[PDB]
Ligand binder design. Sequence first.
Ligand SMILES: CN(C(=O)c1cc2ccccc2cc1C(=O)[C@@H](c1cccc2ccccc12)P(=O)(O)O)C1CCN(C(=O)c2ccc3ccccc3c2)CC1
Ligand SMILES: *[C@@H]1O[C@H](CO)[C@@H](O[C@@H]2O[C@H](CO)[C@@H](O)[C@H](O)[C@H]2NC(C)=O)[C@H](O)[C@H]1NC(C)=O
Ligand SMILES: *[C@@H]1O[C@H](CO)[C@@H](O)[C@H](O)[C@H]1NC(C)=O
Ligand SMILES: [Co+2]
Length: 226
Amino acid sequence: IIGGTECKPHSRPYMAYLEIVTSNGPSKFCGGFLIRRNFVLTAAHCAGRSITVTLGAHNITEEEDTWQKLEVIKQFRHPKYNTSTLHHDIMLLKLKEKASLTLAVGTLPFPSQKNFVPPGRMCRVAGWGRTGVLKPGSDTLQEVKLRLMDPQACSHFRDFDHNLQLCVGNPRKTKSAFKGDSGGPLLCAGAAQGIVSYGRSDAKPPAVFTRISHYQPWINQILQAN
Ligand SMILES: CN(C(=O)c1cc2ccccc2cc1C(=O)[C@@H](c1cccc2ccccc12)P(=O)(O)O)C1CCN(C(=O)c2ccc3ccccc3c2)CC1
Ligand SMILES: *[C@@H]1O[C@H](CO)[C@@H](O[C@@H]2O[C@H](CO)[C@@H](O)[C@H](O)[C@H]2NC(C)=O)[C@H](O)[C@H]1NC(C)=O
Ligand SMILES: *[C@@H]1O[C@H](CO)[C@@H](O)[C@H](O)[C@H]1NC(C)=O
Ligand SMILES: [Co+2]
């Protein structure tokens, strides 16, 4: 998160920290959020050989009794996820066991395909991503308020599609989601509407978020079958 503030510890109980092991190189991390006791929603580009989810955290390098760490047993990348168009950057993760719901660990619902969030309103995103182009990922969970922009604001992003993605962050400000925040949810009025997908390597807003509403049917299918 660029230009955000540290969250009040445990104020966003649905936040999930993902530690991903790549079939080949260094490990990496992403954000995500609990939509069911045993399911976490995140970005498809965050997939890997194996993933461990940590719930109930704030300072990810400091274990707390609120922590619930669970191994992912199944990765469900959207079938149409495309690395060229970067469309459908969404994925569901099934946890080895159901997490226990506590004040520090809770679920968040996903929106209906009929509910299309239009440009103009203010939302917020949280994450453990880098706080600058040359800064490491934040130890603590950060959050920032960002403006939902007209899709035209994201025309410089190849294949940007208003029906599938959200254009987030006023370009005349430096505040923005950034590397490491991927997979993390964008909340507008307390309801999840997007998933951090990608943006400029130089961290300049706006960034691209997956429009969650568009994938409700797909999400419900997976939940039904698992
Ligand atoms: C240098 N960058 C950034 O510093 C960056 C800027 C951002 C700005 C705003 C919001 C989110 C952002 C996320 C990132 C990343 O690098 C992500 C990340 C890491 C690795 C592969 C990823 C694949 C798809 C989406 C995010 C990915 P990360 O957050 O997972 O680590 C980004 C610039 C634009 N990108 C690409 O053209 C791109 C597309 C397909 C790819 C497929 C395989 C490998 C690399 C790839 C890179 C992505 C990296
Ligand atoms: C996040 O947690 C870690 C681990 O507790 C903090 O790192 C330590 O920071 C303290 C500051 O009181 C230092 O005295 C130690 O030397 C550090 N040790 C380690 C393990 O690196 C880190 O500062 C915390 N970050 C915050 C609160 O922003
Ligand atoms: C990604 O979509 C592009 C553009 O529509 C298409 O050419 C390609 O087949 C897709 N990616 C793959 C190889 O699945
Ligand atoms: Co605490």
